[PDB]
Amino acid sequence: LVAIQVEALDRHRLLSDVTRALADEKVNILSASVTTSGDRVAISRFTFEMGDPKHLGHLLNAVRNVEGVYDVYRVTSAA
Amino acid sequence: LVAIQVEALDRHRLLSDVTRALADEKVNILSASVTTSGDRVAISRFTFEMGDPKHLGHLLNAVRNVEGVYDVYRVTSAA
């Protein structure tokens, strides 16, 4: 049940890009939500289950190739 | 700042599909978040500003054609 925070420029295409990029593999997410940080910054948050390290590993690296996305950080912390 | 509650099966694919429709019509979304209501049901929330009712009206009807989505309800707050 590890979450993921995808940071990207505040746009209307970047969001669909992240959702689409991950959707390409029908990655069933337990929770998807995006909120604007300040102004030109869009912070997305995807909560899903884990299984294969190759997919979770390639996922992060893949997001890096997403033009406009700052970086990705696995959200979780204590509880 | 009206919101929208889209109920659909717990699948990110549904969220991405709904987001695609929004961007397709230049629908600038301020924010969004979906959570699993029970088991095979996920409540998706979307916050976006609008002015024309024809677009907001057609959007709801369009969402109905989204395979997996039970129904949509305009979310709002007061005070």
Side-chain angles (χ1 to χ4, degrees):
Chain A
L1 206 88
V2 186
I4 311 174
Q5 235 180 331
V6 188
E7 217 158 319
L9 305 161
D10 194 326
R11 246 174 164 161
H12 45 216
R13 263 211 184 193
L14 271 178
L15 239 152
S16 267
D17 216 281
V18 183
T19 16
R20 181 253 190 70
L22 289 161
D24 220 306
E25 263 131 54
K26 287 162 141 218
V27 185
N28 263 14
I29 315 169
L30 298 175
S31 332
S33 80
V34 61
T35 71
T36 59
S37 212
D39 271 63
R40 272 183 178 162
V41 188
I43 311 178
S44 286
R45 233 236 310 282
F46 288 172
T47 296
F48 80 126
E49 219 188 298
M50 228 222 104
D52 271 272
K54 259 160 137 98
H55 286 248
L56 192 142
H58 258 310
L59 242 79
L60 270 113
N61 227 300
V63 190
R64 300 211 160 174
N65 276 297
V66 188
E67 266 187 37
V69 183
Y70 249 79
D71 217 30
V72 188
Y73 267 134
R74 288 175 302 171
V75 188
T76 23
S77 303
Chain B
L1 304 149
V2 188
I4 310 180
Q5 242 172 334
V6 189
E7 234 179 327
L9 305 173
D10 188 24
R11 267 138 180 281
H12 143 65
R13 233 207 164 196
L14 304 178
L15 283 308
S16 168
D17 217 33
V18 186
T19 304
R20 201 195 184 183
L22 302 159
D24 205 24
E25 226 137 25
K26 271 145 166 197
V27 188
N28 261 27
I29 312 99
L30 295 168
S31 268
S33 194
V34 61
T35 37
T36 52
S37 219
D39 268 339
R40 270 142 144 167
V41 279
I43 318 180
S44 323
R45 271 141 137 196
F46 282 79
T47 302
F48 78 130
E49 218 199 340
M50 261 271 101
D52 277 38
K54 270 207 160 151
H55 275 28
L56 211 99
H58 222 39
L59 222 113
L60 273 118
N61 268 25
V63 192
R64 307 191 104 161
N65 278 297
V66 188
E67 269 173 310
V69 183
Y70 249 45
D71 218 340
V72 187
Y73 261 93
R74 271 160 70 198
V75 188
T76 42
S77 298

